[PDB]
Amino acid sequence: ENSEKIKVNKTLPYLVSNVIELLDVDPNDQEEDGANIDLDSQRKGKCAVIKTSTRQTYFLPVIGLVDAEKLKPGDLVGVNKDSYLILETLPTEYDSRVKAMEVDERPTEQYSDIGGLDKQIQELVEAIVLPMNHKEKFENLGIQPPKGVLMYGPPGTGKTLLARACAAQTKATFLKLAGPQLVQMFIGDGAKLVRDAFALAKEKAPSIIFIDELDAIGTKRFDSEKAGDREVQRTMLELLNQLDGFQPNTQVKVIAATNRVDILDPALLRSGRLDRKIEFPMPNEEARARIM
């Protein structure tokens, strides 16, 4: 009898909602007002809340149809618009799962097929690939791995091609993030996008987060008047703190590249920040021949 009952509410249109507060004591809270003239906002929510997407908040007492401990303060739940009870638990993460996150599960590049790039390859292989595997050596030493790499030099040298070859080789997921993409019209949106990027990364482990730009994620201005450009700064700072906030993960590998030759926007002092320096070597005649 119960099985048919629940099923009917699932067939769409259906309300998904977001649980803001887990808690299961101290009911009552408040939403909406009267009118007349003079304007100051107010909002509230307690006990357990779900805020449904007409922008309405609801008070429910818990059911065992899904367990509340298994639920979180910030979880998507599937609700039966009748009594407003949580029929089911939905997956993890809210809102956008990044508005343009490109996943490359297996790149098509290999570095064993291009020689004459050689000097750069030697350094690259040694940087990324070696900590994951060689972990046992690291553990005995007691030093830890890096987490970020910097590559600088004249663009368009096929610097990126080698990054795509290492990703193919290593068996991490390659995640391409472009720096103007994080920038939005919308206010504070990017920090959520980066936090999410990080979170998706945690689940995927290993991963390479490839960050194009250190110009649209490498400015923050040291100008006195800089307030208007606050958005740009907030995002950049967010990345740096997200790195500084905790103590490293060996689930993420981050590689950063420039797109205009050399700026100063400090992001390299710790190794939880960037610490490895790859330089493009000026062209060697022998190398050019080899490529040819």
Partner: protein, 97 residues
Amino acid sequence: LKVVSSSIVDKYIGESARLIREMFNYARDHQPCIIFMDEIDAIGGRRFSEGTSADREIQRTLMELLNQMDGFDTLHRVKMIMATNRPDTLDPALLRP
């Protein structure tokens, strides 16, 4: 009680104001408590072109910080730690303890 500054800024009306206030309220009941603000620069900005683009939010948050001080509230056992990268956007009321 840990603050990440760019989660306080949102694209919704009066959330920064609602959030800070409640947060401050919770500290007085619960006292003693330390509120650690890491890299305030969502509070850092006195404007110059005198916008209200995103800039109205800057004014919203700043005003809240001052409102708590200007009030009949006393951080009774409440401690505040701020982190700033470059200091130049301080208010004239902060110089005074």
